[PDB]
Amino acid sequence: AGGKVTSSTGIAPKRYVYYPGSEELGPDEIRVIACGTGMPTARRAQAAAAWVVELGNGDKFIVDIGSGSMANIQSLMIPANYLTKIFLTHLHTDHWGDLVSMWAGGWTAGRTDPLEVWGPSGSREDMGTKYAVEHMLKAYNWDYMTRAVTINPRPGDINVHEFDYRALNEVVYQENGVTFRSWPCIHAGDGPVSFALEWNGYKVVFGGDTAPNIWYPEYAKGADLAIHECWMTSDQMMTKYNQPAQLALRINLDFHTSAQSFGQIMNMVQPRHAVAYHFFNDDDTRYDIYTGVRENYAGPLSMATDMMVWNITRDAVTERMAVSPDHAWDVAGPSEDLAPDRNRASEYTQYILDGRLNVDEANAHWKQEFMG
Template identity: 25%
Template sequence: MTTHRLLPLLAACVFSAAAQAATPDSCDAERVQLQVLGSGGPELNDQRASTSYLIWLDGKARVMVDVGGGSSLNFEKSGARFADLDAVLFTHLHVDHSADWPVFVKGGFFTGRDRDLPVYGPYGNHLLPAVDKFQEALLGLGWSYLSNYLVNDERAAYKLPATVVNAEDTVWFQSLERVTLKGLNVNHGPLPAVAWRVEAAGCSIVFSGDTSATSDNLTRLATSADLLVAHNAIPEAATGVARRLHMPPSRIGEIAAQAGVKKLVLSHRMLRTLERESDTLREIRKNYQGPVDFADDLSKYAL
């Protein structure tokens, strides 16, 4: 074949490959669901478990994001099986996102789990440890009888290998057998925090965690997501420390619109935002017109 005939053919092939690469995978929505185990924050009188989520794939709970207080009871109520989990993700290590982890680890002894359960979470600083050091202190020192899950100990049927994520500019990712995990650092005042994107069966769910979202990292991570779980911890008029730690409803709406997310679920609902849903929705609607839902414990969402 002559060169002048070959060049158009090569150009067509390159264009076709680029077009295919640019076409997003379609979400097989019947296979994937989000379930909220804990829709509250750190308060005692909100009648809610603290932050925790499950991603179900083909009828099995495969990924758990955060494990706040009360989540272990709702995990049981959900019908999930600890042995089915492929990964546990921490957005950050405040108590309302991590307190039930020893409960799950101890309870896992009675579930028949016989394969390692990888744990992923944020880097550390002078205020909070990295996820690996956190787990070592929690299970190795705080509850030393659980330390065999951290070391090569024949008494433990599985281990809890921890991976530290510190991704400020480039998206971190890890492909597992059934899901792909992606993470980016987000602003939560001076505290280490990671927003997560979980992809399965062509579907994508993004978890903001607690963040003021002063950078564009959450927007980048949530681009074209099928569902964004955003934390509605403060009202629009909040100031001071609360505003430095959390994003107001207007910022949630901006991010959802800019990222083009298909559905928005508001969680981490606190007393200062409960009963103010109409105000919250009004601020969000200034930018985002897609479906919005206010989460409750054990709410379940199809994609």
């Protein structure tokens, strides 16, 4: 498997696994990493929905950042300054729960710029992305204020770009040769969208969540990589959640995209490569889902799980697994020492600072060796 090894002390070429941080990205290349593929029910094997897109022109994007996904993002060895642009398909916790963790961790770990967040509006102000992030920053005000005591607050801001969720395939970002368009999803209530990323002859579609709709098959047509929700079977709903049959059947027809519907949809789209996600990917669930899909779609398919990676180039769309460090660490970026705002008042009161314990004797031994 992998490229032929030509040499005893050299590097193995075209490796059968993707080791994050080991492979340069070609100027006509895209890398997409599934940093979460699961559900609002949490699990070590699957973080909630998250995707990292890396373009050969050096731009990077996170599309969705659900609960748990930061552990996988952080295993990528990408500096925090290269991941400042996040697109949200919808405001479910399994699609933006870890925004706070990228916000606070990336700032404790030297992001110098503010985060930038694109997400949809709702039917009214309290149902949209601008309200959502504004209240998230208030929810975390203690964190924000205490950390801004010692770190310039500028990376602590979130610049929100809200767009009309009703818009049919309209441009929502246009920068440095890169476009995103959105269209609507049919999912729990008005607001949710899917995205298409256009750059340099490629199209990458992030379906978010939806029941099957008329918009996706139209605006996703001919994508290099087409991502779409694909649900657990009605039999699995009966077995895993003890649903009675009526309600089990309806989940796969009214509320979600069935495996058989996902097949219908990607048959219409004819992408280079289709990606099914948002099911629990276990030894007793996956096979009936892949069969549901094969009933109607025959093209190349990935059955997504965490740390699956796609390399998009002119000749091929290639699926591999990323082999990344469980014991992850922050990895430094180029950026320069950004200064705290020393007008910032302390958030301690003297009542608390009065309780400091004297540990001089306990610490003298290691201090003296370390200062030596």
